[model samples]
Each structure stands twice: as C-alpha cells, then as structure tokens.
Target: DEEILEKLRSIVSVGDPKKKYTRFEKIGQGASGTVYTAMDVATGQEVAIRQMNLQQQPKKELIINEILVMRENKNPNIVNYLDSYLVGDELWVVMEYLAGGSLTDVVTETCMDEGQIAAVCRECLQALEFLHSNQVIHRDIKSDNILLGMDGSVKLTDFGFCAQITPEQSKRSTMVGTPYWMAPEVVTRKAYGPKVDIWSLGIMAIEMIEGEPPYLNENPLRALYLIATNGTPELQNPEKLSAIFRDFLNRCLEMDVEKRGSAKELIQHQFLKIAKPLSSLTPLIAAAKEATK
Candidate 1:
C-alpha cells in the first residue's frame, strides 16, 4: 500500500528543500502552497521551488503519486522536474523557472496574433505527442497550467492530477479537470484517453483569441452545467479566425472521441504547418510585461 512510503521519503526524498535552495522572490501563490524563485545553493542555478502543504485524508499517497509522475516524464516541452523534497511539514517540488509566466497572464496582460497562437498550439501539441506516447494523460490542461519562457518557449506544468494509461486500463472514467475548460466526456464521467487533453487545448485556443474561455461569465456551477449538456461550444466569431485554424479547433472539439484526431495527427494540420518559430512570440511576452506595468 506504500502506507509507509511517505515516512521513508520524509527521511530520504533527495536534496533538502530548505537547505539547498535559498528563496529569493515569492513568485506565486495558490491553494496548494506558495512558489518562490530560488537560487540552488549547490550549483547557483535558478529554480522554482513549490512548497506544497501536506494535506488531505490520504496525503501520503497523494504526494507520492505526484512524485512518481514527475519521475516518469522528461521532455523539453514539459517543464523539467529537477528534484523534490519531503520534509516533516511540507513537500517541495523543484521545477524550471519560466520567467515569462503562465498563458493566462499573457491572455489578460497582452494580445496575441493568430501566428502567435498557432506557435503555442504547435508547442503544446508537441508535448502532448510525447505525453501520450509515454501513456500519460494530463487530466488538467488549461491555459493557466501552461508556463512560458522568455524566449517564447511554451511548456506544460502542474501534473497534480495526471493519469497513466496502462495497457489493462487505457481508458479512464475518473471525473477530473477544471470546470470551464473540461471536455464533454470528462463532465459525463465517460471512459476517455489522451484526446481529452486535445479538447481542453481547443477550449484554451478559444481563450487565446477571446481573452477568456466560453461561459467564463457564468458562475462555475452554471459553466459546468453548460459544458456537461452542450454538444460542443463554438467560438463567438469563428469567421474572425482563419479557415484552417477554425478547422483545427473543430477537429479538437469533436464530441466523438474516435472522430477526434490524436496529437500526432493534429500536429500535421495546415495551421501548425504555417506557424512560425516560437522565437516570434518574444514580442507577445514583451507586450504583456509592458501592459502590466
């Protein structure tokens, strides 16, 4: 049961969370815990140190599950999991510090052109391609979970609730995801796989253009109700987006899971083909910082 695993890790999870990293600036805060931009004392490397409070009924298993997933995934488009520490009071997960911040920050702080959005889509799809091949399904995929770098690199973060698709259980029935960006299958508790992420990406695509997700104006409960009942919500002004881009969203938001193409197939779409290098996204990040000030 690994009931004693937490006790073991508390003694030996790796580098000491508090000793090796000297906290610099408080970078973020959320329900789980606080994030700090820290300098790794050993190597003098900058890292994001996330101090998550140990909580919940089965907090031990919960924390270990997160560590296992981090150990399994390693990719350029996926945020690097440098190390983790489990102390008597909290768990510290060390990750790459993406100075550009989250995509939600960009959506509200600055405007993005179609090409910039296309570039983001390509990067996300690239991560998804790697994730699915490794049998990992990121149950939570939203704009806020997308971290960006100064050079315009986009990487997915926060595997707080990811599912590993083993051969015996390829489809998961657990209902997990943010209400506003949840896919229909997830809301219905239907057995689903990697395509669930593709659907969430489509929802985020709409957010990228419109500055918020569909039904964002509604209360979260009403938003959940709409997502659970509606077949597939469409963009308010599909005409404004290019035909290929709109079609790309259409393919991702398809209700029928089988009809929805996998990340491997979706990456070959015309929109991704026309996307420029991520370096072109530097201006968008620059504009976002300018707007915030």
Candidate 2:
C-alpha cells in the first residue's frame, strides 16, 4: 500500500503550486465525498476535484468503484477523468471543470421551464443509455450527479455507487443508494438491476419540474418508508405538466422494474422528441448567461 500510494502521488501533486492552484470553497457534499473547485498548476485552469473520505467504509468502496468506472467508460456525456491519485489516506479524482456546475444548480438558478427541463432530461437519458449499453449500473442517479459542461452539454458524474452487472450478478441486494430516489425494489432490498436507474430518472424528472423531490414528509425516514410501501408516486399537479412528459415519467417509475423503460426507450420518449438533434443546444452559451443572471 505504501508503494502504491507513492506511485499515485507522483502522478499528481496535492496543495497549491506557486499558490496559483488555490483551494476554493467546497462546491458540494454527499454521503461519501466532498467536491471542491481548485486551480491546476500546469495550466492554471479551474477544475473540480472530488476528495473521498477513506474513514467511511461505504465511501472507500465507492471511491474505488468510481476510479474503476471512470477508467473503463469514456464519453462526452459522462464526466471526463483528467487524473486520479491518492494523497495520504484520501483518494482524489480530478475531472474536467464544468463552470456551469450541476443540474441541481441549473434547476435552482434557471427555474427551468418544461421545455428546458425536457431538453436536459433528454441529454441525461442519452448518457444513461451509453452507460447501460456498457453493462454498468449507476446505482445513484440524481440531480446532484448530473453536471453541465461549459459546452452546453450534460455530463453524468459521481460513479460512487455504480456497479457492473454480470450474468451471475444481475441483481444486487445491498440496498445502496440515495433514499428518496431509490426504486421500490431497492428500498425493499429485493433483487434489483439497472432498472433502478430508470426509477431514479422518473423521480428526477419530477424534481426538475417541481424544484424538489416527490413524497416529502416531515421526517426523511418516514418519506423513505413511504417510498417502499407506496404503489406509485403521483404528480401533485398532473394537469400543469405536459401529458407526454407525465407519461414518460410514469413509464420510467413503473412499480415493476421489468415494465420500466430502457435507456433507449427513455431517449425516444415523446417528451424528448423536440430535442432529438441535441446539437442545437450546444456551445454552453446559455450556461454562462444563466450563471451570471
């Protein structure tokens, strides 16, 4: 382990170089890690760095898994791994800096109309399709994990809970994921597979539409329990939402994982028909303006 640590450190140096790679404030925090904005010494470019807490068992496994997943999968819609290394006991992953930040930021800032939300969802589904085709399961799928590139593209990040599915291990029993976004099968600790991601996408769509998650209660634990027992999540204002969009969400969040739409089906949903080409939203010009305003 000591030798491995030394080798990892040599790849990337920690701390500020010439005081130019300043450690800015943290951008976000999750169950396993914290993300911060920092500068790169060589290029003086701003970058987002995710530092995993090795003290936590789940976090340790997550960091290890993220490294493996990012190493294996490379695509534009997925966060680009620039470098990875170990600093003392902590694991650090350096990724392409997305100035526009995360989908959570976008939803809060822009107050996305249905059209814009549909556009973003379409891109994310495409990313999911890519990941699914590669035989990987993104166990944790949420707004916080979706990032916006400087080029006006959506990139999926935080593969901490992701796992590979093999013929032998098609279903997982670990009950590992964010509570509110977990599929019913996952909440019940039943054998589950990639369809859980589809359930999360459904919940995420509602979050984008309402600026919060569905099934909110006074106690978070109660809310999670409700998710496990509930038949299906009902849209509070179904009338206000587009029918096709609502139907798409319903399909993804279907009670039976078998009935849920695949990533391919999600991409082709009628709600996303308007954003089919996807290129028209390019150059991330809107992101900069959205950030400023």
Candidate 3:
C-alpha cells in the first residue's frame, strides 16, 4: 500500500522505531523538536524520546554531541541513556524518564532551606567530579540542567554544550554556556577548563537561594559584559549567607582560576557537610508538582 511504502521511506537510516516504541504524550519542547513520553514495547518501561531536527544550522552538531556524551558516560548523578535511532532528518534519542521534573521546578516553586540547597549542591558536585575526571567539561551547569526523580534522586542532563578534552590538551578557549551562569574566564574568552563548571554551579546555588540568578533582569549580552568586568558577584543580601556558605561561594566564584577548588576538592567543603539525606528533597519535589497543578 502507499501508506506502508511512505512509512518505509520515512525511516531511511535506522530501523523503524514505531514498531518497537509506542509514543505517548509530549513532555518537553526544544528548539530542535519535541520530547515525548513513550513506552518501550519490549520491556514495558516508560521512557523519554527526544526528537531533534537535523536540518537546523546549529541543531545537527548539538544533538550529535549530546548523544555521544550521554551514550559514553555513565554515572548515578547523570541521566541514563537507553537507546538512539536515526529517522531520516529527525533523530530520536531514548532516555530514562525522571518523574520529579527539572530542578528549576523545585527552585521556582518551593522554599528551600540551606540544608536542601546543600544536598542539591552535593549531588551536582558528584556528577561534576565524574565528568571532570574524564576531562569532560560540562560547559553548561544550571538548575535547568538538573533533573530529579520522585524518590528524591538528582541527576544532571543536557549535554549540548559539553566538551571533552584529551589529557594532552587541558584547556579550552571556546566561550559557551548560559550568560547568567558563565564564569568570568569564559565570558572574557580566556583558556579555561573544568573549573568553569564550578563557577556556574556557584551561580546556580545562588539561584536556589534567591529564586533567580544575578542579571536575571538584564539583557543576556549585558549580563556577560558584567560578568567579564565584575570580579565576583555578591548576593543581593550578603548577610543572608552563613560563614561556611560564603566560603564555599568564594572558592567557586574565584576570578583567579588557580585558587578555584576542583570538584573533587569541593566535595569536602564544610558547606557540603550540612547536606541532608537525598530523601529530604522529596517534600520540595512534591510541593513543586502540586503548584504545577
């Protein structure tokens, strides 16, 4: 039949995924395409399928990098990639579905105590530690990139801006990542390394406390300019941070990369000592879900 022939023609590269997976509903939307919740017909497990259009100028390279990183890396704090398929101009990537939603949801909708913030930071640092050891720089590290499960599990996702450097070449000059969370060295176009992720995490910690990052109200380009010029950003109310918290931020946001603590070193900070159990975050996730309803 014409319909059968049309379906066969649609999938010119990889085998047809329609028979193996049943599409449910769209759970996310991106510049390239849509992400849907789908059922794995074989295992009967629910998964998220990210559909990316290969035609967009920057789109093709970005998804390719994402899939490469997600496929190669395996960490408890990172999203687990199941499978990937090429469907002509559209690439479908399957990943484990996190029921609790993104960390942005928790940050915006719930009031987080210092302990909760520390817990989230601890989990993120673990993920950073793993990536840094592999010489993989997560150029982008923001609350939006953090996902949580209903069981209070935290995981890092979105590898579009991730870069892997070899042991021989330790520094990267590429200026990538979000404007608000960008490290000064990155915004200034200087050679940087894994420490850039630390700076962004510092900014994300601020976002968790203040419900927004610095320069949230300003233009993105202007924000980058400010980050390049300003040595380090102070919280809106400096008195709100505890002594330990202040020290941690100072270490992370250090303009001098030499003094910046690596993810491994930062995991030992006193601020992280205050982190509660991962289950402590269940209430915040619940609160965020309720607010969404």
Candidate 4:
C-alpha cells in the first residue's frame, strides 16, 4: 500500500530556542533581519544565524518559503542551509558561514580586470544554472547577493526574493527585486521566467565594471522607471570594456524576453571562456577582508 504521507523531515523542531546555537556577533543586517555568526553547541561547528522578527503573517510566510527553497536546493555554489525555523516571536535561520565578504564589498574595495569579472560571472552563471534547473527563479541577483569564500568559492545567497515555478505554471509576474538590478520585464510587470535572472546578471556584471550599477545617480523610483522604459543600458565606457564581454552582457540584457539567453547558454559565452581559475579570486577576497578590517 502506498501512502501519500511520505516526505522528508528534519530533527530540529519549530518553536525551539536559538540558544542551541551560541551567537557570536552581528555579521550582517538587512531589511528583514540581522545575521550573526554562531557556534553550534551540539557539534562545535561554526554557522551563520539570521534572525527575523516574526510579526507579520505574510512576511513570516516568506521566511518559511525561503527555508523551503534552501532546504530543497542544495549546491556548492549556493550557501548550504543548516537549521532554520520559528522560535517564539522570531525566525532563526542557521546556515554555512562564509568568511570572505560579498562581491559588492569586493567591487567597492578593488578594481577587477575583464578576466576577473568574467571569472565572477562564470561562477554566478554556474549557480544560476543550478537554481533555474530546480524550477526556482532568484528574482533578485546583484553584487550584494554574490558572496565569496576564503577558499576561492563563489556563492549566491539571499533567496528571499526567489520564486518557484511548478510544472503547472512556468512563469511569474510579481514585481519583486532591487531597483537597480530589476529586469525590464519584471519592472513592467510581465509574466517572465528564469530569463529574468539573466537580466539581473547583466546588471550585476555592469555593477562589477562600473563600481556600481547602471543608474547610480538616479533616485530609486526613477531607476525603476528607467529599467521599465529603456531599450538596453550601455556601459559607461564601451571602448574600455572588451568587445566579447560587452556582447555577452548584451545577450543577457536583451529587452525582448524571446531573445534572451538562458543561464546554461551563457555558461559557454566567450567572456566566461577566458575566465581564470577560481583560486585567482583569492586576492580580491583578501583585499576585501583587509578593507573591512
């Protein structure tokens, strides 16, 4: 007899106190929560704990949604999920601790060559491919969400805006994401798929090149308007960037959703083909850490 009751579950229970993990210090603070480095008392393993106030029902549901995504989608390029559940009036999430800072910090501190940027893009594309294959759309993709590891590993984090498209529905129309990196179709509120992430990847690439996103000076609302109405954003200095890299971004930033390339397709792009080894990024990671200190 087959039972519909078969499903994977974790030993950790909901409403359990976060005291099981000893908090170290505030590592990161975001709009929804504060992240801390913690030590697992049971195993002495280092972990990152993010705390979110479980006040609003809708936001709490989103937290649960993120937890589900993290639980199901496991990959090296994606941050490893540990224990995350509701405890009291707060949501405590435990995850793998990444020592090196985010790509946003790396770009703000050091300038990268075309090859370095390509290497980063390649790594991000690798992660995006994994996510897309899992039927998930990381609605937000930007430098801030791209993290680096001391061991030269690149990871994609912050799945808060991610949306899953089941076989029943292959597209979504929710307008969710950071303004600067939002896709044109997303900004215009059109039904879109994983290709939206590709658009944000192009924006992230521009952020890496220009030391910021395309519309750095514009107000947030205006930036959203620009993304919705503009044809395609051009690099500030086209001559300064390599032609192949420019073309690569062009394919990703295409306004017509029909013409946009997928993450798997971009993995073989000429720009990424010239990318150096992941270890080559060690220096960038070090510089970012040093600057943080």
Candidate 5:
C-alpha cells in the first residue's frame, strides 16, 4: 500500500509547477481506476485526478492513447487534460474538475424537458462533430459519460474506448459497451463505425425524455434480441418532441447503419436549432420545461 501511495504522490507532484495539488479525498471509482478531488497548492484551484489501475489490460497503452486523444482535441465541449504522468507502472491524469457532475445524475434527478434535452443533445452533437472530424470515434456515448461543468455546460468525457476510424477499418466487430446502449450492429458483432455512436446518442435522447432507455426487459439476452430484431424506436407522442428532434433520433437509431446520419450531419439537424448562440443553450431550464410538458 505504501509503495503504491508513494508512486501516486510522485506522479502528481512533479513537473506541474503551475499548481501544486494536495490530494483530498476519493471522488469515484470505476472498473479500472479511481478518481480523487484535489486542491492545487500553487493557484489554489481545484482539480480531479484519475489514478488508473495497472492491473487492467495494457494499462500503459490505454493511458498513452488517452493522452494522445486529449492532446489532439482542443474543444471546450471536451474534457481538458491538465497534465499526466507515470510512476511505478501507474498512470495519473490530471483534469479540470466539474462541479455540476454527470449528465446521468442530472437526467435521473429530474426528467430533462424537451428543450433541455435538445440543448444537451446539441452540445453532444457538436462535440461528436469535433471528434468525428478528427477521425476519432468515441465507441461509448451515454449519459454516464457526459459531464456537466459548473456553468451547466456539457463536455464529453472518457476516452478509454475511443479510436480513430480509418478508411480501411470503418467498421468494428467487437461487442463492447453497456448492453442496452449498444447499437444493433455493435451487439451483433458486425462491422460498424462512427454510426454506432449515433445509435447510442439516440438511446441517450430517449432516456432523457422518458428517464429510461427505450427497451428494458427483465432478461439481458432477451433485451439484446429485441434490440437486434426490432424496428426503429418510435416516440409515442411525436408532437411532444420537436419534429426535427424526433426525426434526428429516428435517423440515428435506424437499423441500417448505411442510412444513419453521420455525427457532422446530426449536428446540423433542425432539432438542435436554437435562435441564440449554441453556447447560450447550456443551462436550458426554460427549454426543458417547455418540451417535457
């Protein structure tokens, strides 16, 4: 235990002269890592530290890919990487601390009205546009991975499953991701690409409106079968949602990957249309109220 602690301390304390952080307390834990809230000693700012478990598959490679992804990405809608370091086979990633928590918490707390859901969807689509523009496909796109900033802005996080979509390898046959959220093609272990993310986003939109994913069965295998064989998701009250928004979701959840809208195309859908600047829609409380009703 002492050896592990020393290794973590060394990684967090070195090279980052702008802020010296005093590790505070553990904030969260995942399958391969633990997150901690810390205070920056140099500037007195707060930050989050992710300590990755070396026990996981190719920990070093994952950390290196994360660093590369973060370094290449320079958008406000994406999480910022303050710094990174390695000590004794452990990897530490320092990032901006978000006070507003995860989108999963927000949507689950109070069903996000249509407007708020649209706003979040717009931000996510924009982020996806940026990522896909760079040829990177975020294999996982769900409420749990969408984080909120202090100002209520949305930022996409978690790059563990992100990968570049090369022309030669547009489709992935690997069945990875949370069960219900996986796209039809992904669940079947068929070749797929960035379109899989669109499917996940559509599911997320459904969850935002209904407070749960569209298909929920008592048995996991049954649910998978239903998703694989079912037609496109149907919103019961289409009039309740923005016409374009519902259409966008339908396109995203299309059983045919070839017909699904690309991330860039989805960003331009009328559902995400707002009269004001896109940035102003972050705290879409009014929008949420109007849509959900």
Candidate 6:
C-alpha cells in the first residue's frame, strides 16, 4: 500500500465561526469578489480578505484553481497567500495586506520617470521569471495586478487567468487576458506560451510611462483587432524615451514569438540597469496614499 494515500488533501473546508478575524473596511475589488482589510485577533496582524459568494459565481472550479495556484507559489515578488475557509456559502481567502495599494493607484496619483518605471519592470520581470520557470503563466499582467507595499516592495497578484503548462498542454490557445494588454498571438487565437506575459509586460511598461494603454479609447473588440493587426505599437512620445529603453521595449514587444525575449533574458536589459533602488518608490506610494485619503 502507498503511504501517500494517507496524506491530507489541501482542500479548504468549513470550520466553527469563532470570529477569529475582524473585518475593517472594503479595500479593493477583484475579478471574482470583494476584498477587505481584516485583522487576526490572535496574532494582531492585518491581512487582506477576499470574500466570494459561492451562490452567484458562474465558474466555481476556476476560483479553487486560483487559490491553489496562489498557495503553491512563494516568491518575494509574489503575493503571500495565508489561508482560505468556507463560511456560510462564501469563501474567505486571506492574504498579506499591502498598504501602498496597486501600481494603478500610483500611476493615477503621481508620475514616474524612466528610472521608476524600470524599477517596477525589473521587479515584475523577476516574478515572471520565477513563475515561467515553474511552468506557470500569469495570463493577466496589467498594472492593477501589480501590488505595492508602503515599504517599496512590489509583488504580483490576481491569478484569475493563470495557467499551468502541463506536459500534455505545453501551449495555450485560449484568449483569456485583458484585450488592451494582450499579446498579438493571443489576440490572433494562435497557440502561445509564457511569452504572452512578456508582451503584456511591454504594454504595462507603456502604461507606466503614458498613464494608459494603447487603443484604450476604442471598444474592447476593436482593441483586440488592432493588437492582432498592428504588428507593434509605436509610442506616442518615442523621442522622450532613451535609446536603451526603446530597445528594451522592442525586445519585449516583438511580433515573432521566437524573437521575443524571455523573462530571464530581459532581466539583463540595459533599461533595467538604470532601475533605482526599491526604496526609491516609497515617496510615490506615500503621495498616492495621501492623495487618496
């Protein structure tokens, strides 16, 4: 008999409602549910809790997959998933609370120079490198998925569209990512790999600099058509970017999948060389928080 049969499963289960966690206020919204700031009574540690109503969810299985994916990954650049529980037909998922909010908050409230953009991109690439090496694809790589801490730490979150590249499924053909940041191959319905994330990161790089993604004013379907047919998008202010930064974007936004640089390869880019210290972002985070308050 195999001893593995006796091992406990990782499935989440319901428990007695002793009120161990206290909810404070709604912090943000996720693709699947509402997120709130909560505190653990025993440890006195603040955490983020996402509550999803099971009765209303259209895709039940996908939510569990997202929880499992988040539980398995443990990288500094990835959000730390703590626990999950089923309570009264709702699922409560607890995770580390980042006070600096998402990168979108920073972009909307303040401006970041090339150095700051490079810093965020470098951290994001590190996370992508880790995920890709483990055969996982973060299909959604928008600014909103990039969370920040008041301490200037950058982490990737929201694995709602994450995919695992099993041996039987080496490439994915499903169109699942945000249209504005989607790769051309994905928009064209071609089989693609982790390189799709790289292309999305390239688009997010533009978003960090320009405050919006290309084709944003158009309808989502039109944006998908533009991504599929436009080859590569040219920056509106190319003259403002440095030569090396332009080259970095070129490597990431390449139409040919074979020519596009992987996360590991892009880490060596000259643009990243200009990446400032992680702490350099603290001021921007503070400014955003103050402005929001």
Which stretch of 10 consecutive residues in model 6 shows the poorest summed lDDT?
1-10
lDDT per model vs. reference: 0.83, 0.75, 0.85, 0.82, 0.74, 0.86
Q: What is the full ranking by lDDT, best candidate first?
A: 6, 3, 1, 4, 2, 5
- Candidate 4 lDDT over residue span 186-230, tens digit each: 767568899989999998888888889888789999998887887
Worst ten in a row by lDDT for model 3: 4-13
Residue-pair clashes, model 1? 0
On lDDT, the leading prediction is 6
TM-score-wise, the better of 2 and 5 is 5
Writing each residue's lDDT as its tens digit, candidate 1 over 218-273 gives 99888988988886887788788899998898998998989997999998999987
Q: Model 2: how far is 281 from its true place, Å?
A: 8.0
RMSD of 6: 3.9
Model 4's alpha-carbon lDDT is 0.82
Q: Is candidate 1 or candidate 6 better by TM-score?
A: 6
Model 4 C-alpha RMSD to native: 4.2
Q: Evaluate model 5: give its TM-score.
A: 0.83
lDDT of 6 at 290: 91
lDDT of 5 by residue, 144-201 (tens): 8888764668889888778877777766676657767878887665677888888899
Candidate 5 accuracy as lDDT: 0.74
lDDT of 2 at 219: 71
Tens-digit lDDT track of model 2 for 1-293: 45545554665557533344476668779765788888887787788777765555343445556676887899888988877755556777778787666777665555566666778888888888998888898988998898776556788987877888888777787877888888888767668888888888888888887777776543767777888888578877899877888888889889977788999887878888755333433433365346756
RMSD, each candidate, Å? 2.3, 4.0, 4.5, 4.2, 5.1, 3.9
- Candidate 2's C-alpha runs over 4 A off are 1-35, 41-44, 51-59, 87-90, 276-293
Candidate 4, pairs of clashing residues: none
TM for candidate 2 is: 0.82
